[PDB]
């Protein structure tokens, strides 16, 4: 919808696969932490399992900034689980260090305004949310083009800097 920074981010709950298990997560569960919520389309893709792997591999950098990264797509909780079990060599996902939140009702994606209604999957949206649950950053790419880990870290730094100071 009309998503705007400096307003409370739309709340979301759902089943996410974490370390090979189904756990229910809620945006409120991360109160006190920064949250990067990023959506992707399809799954076991011939290109770009790599983008998700990219963020997973640098998960250390996000834990460092007191930030929880959450990946999300319009697939079922079971599809996600399958992607983890598939190794990286096959077009799979290998080991995952960040939660895959499943959005099969498409409601979370439509809530963050990133749903391609014509095709039924999400755009490449990225959202940064405050420890108080306030939206700080909105990024949406056309489907072919992916996201930088460095850019997300740069933004996280800027926001956390302003949070401590402001100049």
Residues 75 and 120 sit within 8 Å (Cβ to Cβ): no
Structure tokens at 52: 């998700």
- CA 134 from chain centre, in angstroms, equals 16
Distance CA 110, CA 116 (A): 8
Q: Which two tokens stand for residue 95?
A: 């080991």
Here the tokens at position 61 are 């950098």
Which CATH number is 146's domain given? 3.40.30.10
Residues with catalytic roles: 48
Tokens of 7: 């307003």
In three-state secondary structure terms, 3 is coil
Helices (H), 7-138: 50-57, 59-64, 77-85, 107-111
Q: What is the DSSP string of 109-152?
A: HHHTT-EETTTTEE-EEEEEE-TTSBEEEEEEE-TT----HHHH
Solving technique: X-ray
Q: How far apart are CA 96 and CA 145, in angstroms?
A: 22
CA distance 108 to 113: 9
End-to-end CA separation in angstroms for the chain: 32
Specify the 3-state DSSP secondary structure of 102: strand
For residue 129, the cross-strand partners are: 35, 135
Strand partners, 15: 24
In the sheet where 13-18 sits, what is the strand order?
21-26, 13-18, 100-102, 67-73, 34-39, 124-129, 135-141
d(CA 38, CA 54): 13
Domain of 8 in residue numbering reads as: 1-167
Residue 57 CA to residue 153 CA, distance in Å, equals 13
* Number of domains, the chain: 1
């Amino acid at each position: 919808m009309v998503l705007i920074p400096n307003k409370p981010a739309p709340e979301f709950h759902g089943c996410a696969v974490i370390d090979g298990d189904f756990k229910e997560i809620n945006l409120k569960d991360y109160s006190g932490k920064y949250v990067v919520l990023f959506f992707y389309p399809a799954d076991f893709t011939f290109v770009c399992p790599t983008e998700i792997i990219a963020f997973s591999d640098e998960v250390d950098q996000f834990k460092s900034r007191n930030c929880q990264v959450i990946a999300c797509s319009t697939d079922s909780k079971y599809s996600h689980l399958a992607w983890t079990k598939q190794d990286r060599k096959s077009g799979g996902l290998g080991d995952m260090r960040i939660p895959l939140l499943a959005d099969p009702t498409k409601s979370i994606a439509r809530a963050y305004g990133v749903l391609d209604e014509e095709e039924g999957n999400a755009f490449r949206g990225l959202f940064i949310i405050d420890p108080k649950g306030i939206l700080r950053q909105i990024t949406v790419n056309d489907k072919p083009v992916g996201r930088s880990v460095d850019e997300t870290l740069r933004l996280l730094d800027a926001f956390q800097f302003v949070e401590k100071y402001g100049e």
